[PDB]
């Protein structure tokens, strides 16, 4: 009787949702036709007699990925009203995703959200996947987040954001996108996990022993992390969590709400035969820095809040002993004023592997979410990029021709410096 509605905005969001709904429809035994030959009401609606509908909205201002979906093998699954398509892309511009083109499509998706919210009882939150560097995938995200925090009020909202890398770059206006998006999403969203590409590249190259990843492998990893999060809602466990728990464990002040997510174990089938997997080595291997999904140094700060979800048949006495032998080490130092920074969750279901994928049948799995400190040093790196593209007034006319003023960039820089100094004050 506990529900959650997922939305997908932008290209990264709709492809990562293609992978996520692939894992979801694989998980409960349902065919892609939408029939099955009593808990999956938590993500699905029932359709009359012998049919099921997922709860999703795939909003894109560029029609080609929606047409690729409707031609794809999941054509018969969804409802053909819930694929909302604009007429013009944003071309990696934040103002076109927040103001100019995207404002003509917000009424349809808001009526769709209000219609999907009427068919349920105890609605708990929204899970909207979006990227930073793109135009429509951040501007429309800002508009929907501001509008929903206006409209619904006191319900939860969790995000998945793609972190723009310091070294690797694809677009050129990505610091503008991230800075203005963090300028406008800081107030209203509840907690948003950050995930980079290049750490997924490195853990794909080194731990699973792969040489060349396609984009679907990174999306399979992020979809496995999403399923590992909401597996405490989809079934039962000895010590269960739900979606309205993490806000009380991860968010100390109503400004700092930026955790990083991690998974374990990352192995191939050939490395899985010659190692018997106890809980101690995997809980220690959560803290090796090469397996963190964001390019940062966790040794360059402290750990503030730390949540753990377990999956598979794990008994709890060795769990408590593993956390006890974690805390006694020297390198993993903690913050002074937070002595109990652990939130533990266990589920009975073991995970499943996608056929043709990159995972073998491993009996256990760990998801670890961390609100640590040193990530904001990466913030300084990102902030430094902004200084370059404001020192010569680069690319300012392409932004101000769409209805923006110059003082917004200075207010964003002031807000980000304020966030960094609040951070370092709380740290030191």
């Amino acid at each position: 009787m506990r529900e959650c509605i997922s939305i997908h905005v932008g290209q990264a969001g709709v492809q990562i949702g293609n992978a996520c709904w692939e894992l979801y429809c694989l998980e409960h035994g349902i065919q892609p036709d939408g029939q099955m030959p009593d808990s999956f009401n938590t993500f699905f609606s029932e359709t009359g007699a012998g049919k099921h509908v997922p709860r999703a909205v795939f909003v894109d201002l560029e029609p080609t990925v929606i047409d690729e979906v409707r031609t794809g093998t999941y054509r018969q699954l969804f409802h053909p009203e819930q694929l909302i398509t604009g007429k013009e892309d944003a071309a990696n511009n934040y103002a076109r995703g927040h103001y100019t083109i995207g404002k003509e499509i917000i009424d349809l998706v808001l009526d769709r959200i209000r219609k999907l919210a009427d068919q349920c009882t105890g609605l708990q939150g929204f899970l909207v996947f979006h990227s930073f560097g793109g135009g429509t995938g951040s501007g429309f995200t800002s508009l929907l987040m501001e509008r929903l925090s206006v409209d619904y009020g006191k319900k939860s909202k969790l995000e998945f954001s793609i972190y723009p890398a310091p070294q690797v770059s694809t677009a050129v206006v990505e610091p503008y996108n991230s800075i203005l998006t963090t300028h406008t999403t800081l107030e209203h969203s509840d907690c948003a996990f950050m995930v980079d590409n290049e750490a997924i590249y490195d853990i794909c190259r080194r731990n699973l022993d792969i040489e060349r990843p396609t984009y679907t492998n990174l999306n399979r990893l992020i979809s496995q992390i999403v399923s590992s999060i909401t597996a405490s809602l989809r079934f039962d466990g000895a010590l269960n969590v739900d979606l309205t728990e993490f806000q009380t464990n991860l968010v100390p002040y109503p400004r700092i709400h930026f955790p990083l997510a991690t998974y374990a174990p990352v192995i191939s089938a050939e490395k899985a035969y010659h190692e018997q997997l106890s809980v101690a080595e995997i809980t220690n291997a959560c803290f090796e820095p090469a397996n963190q999904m964001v390019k940062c140094d966790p040794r360059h700060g402290k750990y503030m809040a730390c949540c753990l979800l377990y999956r598979g048949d794990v008994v709890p006495k060795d769990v408590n002993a593993a956390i006890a032998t974690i805390k006694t080490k020297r390198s993993i130092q903690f913050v002074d004023w937070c002595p109990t920074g652990f939130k533990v969750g266990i589920n009975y279901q073991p995970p499943t592997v996608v056929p043709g994928g990159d995972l073998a049948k491993v009996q256990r799995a760990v998801c670890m979410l961390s609100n640590t400190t040193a990530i904001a040093e990466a913030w300084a790196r990102l902030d430094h990029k902004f200084d370059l593209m404001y020192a010569k007034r680069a690319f300012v006319h392409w932004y101000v021709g769409e209805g923006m003023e110059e003082g917004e960039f200075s207010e964003a820089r002031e807000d980000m410096a304020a966030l960094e100094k609040d951070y370092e004050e709380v740290g030191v």
Partner: protein, 426 residues
């Protein structure tokens, strides 16, 4: 003729109560269908302490289950021994609190309080002369602690002279399982010092050491720990239901232990605790029971019992025993350790003996101690709490619900008042 209704609040007390009705229903010999299949007539003269006979000789228990997320109730109801609970009793909400004590106290509690009080009012008026109420909640989470707190406040506003039992798992010294835990602990102690006659503190780590170093278990699950708590509860209240040679009901214990009406936090324990590996190397006479009882590592709280002195001790025995052995070996135990006991209370024992044992074993015993060394645990709460209150951490998720800072300062002064009381008498 003395009646006790049962309320379970939260997740932890709900699983404890599932195993508790499991153990009691196995002991009195009644089947999960509700039909009676015991062996003697000694059981059925005393079945009215807990159950009701209902129109076609089927029996129902007297339980009311309370939570805010439905899946716990589904896991209890769909499982085995889920048929005998009457479906009018299940009262819950739909939102959930989730480690927010103001949400478990102020907001959803006002949504569920009148329905739960109405059902318990009908269940209390259906009974003749009730002796006590018992609740099982946890001290860590939101719905358990908050709704058990508000329920106890409403009940002691209603019934002024009926005693209250309350079994509460207490936060851990080594590793916590929730992050906002000292706030929950401090406010829950602030109300439990006000409104409860007896209550018990259970640690998880003491249960872990019990199942490791004495039982030699490899794979402990939560149901088994709950079976240990069920065994202690049945051992405390096996006197109401069966004949005795020195009987001791609940009010006898309540006027036995407490010297002063705030110091009612007990540490319980159970004996014997045997493994199948080392079963043959032992005998089972009363020195084995009385040596495994008065024990350092056998306590069900993570506090070394010789870190102070004792105030009072109660011991409830089960089996066909000999009384002269019992009281001479209790005087032997007080003779051996003269330092560990308060002198201004002499005769620091309280004894009781009933006849029927648990199913399969001959002798067993339940140990209850009001000691002072548990003050150490109180220190490791309040110290932690003060550190978080020095930085105003995590306050806004409470503050946006309706709670103010003066509540926390009053509760901290109350906890330091309670450890002032416990340091006064040693």
């Amino acid at each position: 003729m003395r009646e006790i209704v049962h309320i379970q609040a939260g997740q932890c007390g709900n699983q404890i109560g599932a195993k508790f009705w499991e153990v009691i229903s196995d002991e009195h010999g009644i089947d999960p269908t509700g039909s009676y299949h015991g062996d003697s007539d000694l059981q059925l003269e005393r079945i009215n302490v807990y159950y009701n006979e209902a129109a076609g000789n089927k029996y129902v228990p007297r339980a009311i289950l309370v939570d805010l997320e439905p899946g716990t109730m589904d896991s209890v109801r769909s499982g085995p021994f889920g048929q005998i609970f009457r479906p009018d009793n299940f009262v819950f909400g739909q939102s959930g609190a989730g480690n927010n004590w103001a949400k478990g106290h102020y907001t959803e509690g006002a949504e569920l309080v009148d329905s739960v009080l109405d059902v318990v009012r009908k269940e209390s008026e259906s009974c003749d002369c009730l002796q006590g109420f018992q609740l099982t909640h946890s001290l860590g989470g939101g719905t358990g602690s908050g709704m058990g707190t508000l329920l106890i406040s409403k009940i002691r506003e209603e019934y002024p002279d009926r005693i209250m039992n309350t079994f509460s798992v207490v936060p851990s010294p080594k590793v916590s399982d929730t992050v906002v835990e000292p706030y929950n602990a401090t406010l829950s102690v602030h109300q439990l010092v006000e409104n409860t006659d007896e209550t018990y503190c259970i640690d998880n780590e003491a249960l872990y050491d019990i199942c490791f170093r004495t039982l030699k278990l490899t794979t402990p699950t939560y149901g088994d720990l709950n079976h240990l708590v069920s065994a202690t509860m049945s051992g405390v209240t096996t006197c109401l239901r069966f004949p005795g040679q020195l009987n001791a009901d609940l009010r006898k214990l309540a006027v036995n232990m407490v010297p002063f009406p705030r110091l009612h936090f007990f540490m319980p324990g159970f004996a014997p605790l045997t493994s199948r590996g080392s079963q043959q190397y032992r005998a089972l006479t009363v020195p084995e029971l009385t040596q495994q009882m008065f024990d350092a590592k056998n306590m069900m709280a993570a506090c070394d019992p010789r870190h102070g002195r004792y105030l009072t001790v109660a011991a409830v025995f089960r089996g066909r025993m000999s009384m002269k052995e019992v009281d001479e070996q209790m005087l032997n135990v007080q003779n051996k350790n003269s330092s560990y006991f308060v002198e201004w209370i002499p005769n620091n024992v309280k004894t009781a003996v009933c006849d029927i044992p648990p199913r399969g074993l001959k002798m067993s015993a339940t140990f209850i101690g009001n000691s002072t060394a548990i003050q150490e645990l109180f220190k490791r709460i309040s110290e932690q709490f003060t550190a978080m209150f020095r930085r105003k951490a995590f306050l806004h998720w409470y503050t946006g619900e309706g709670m103010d800072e003066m509540e926390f300062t009053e509760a901290e002064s109350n906890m330091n008042d309670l450890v002032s009381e416990y340091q006064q008498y040693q």
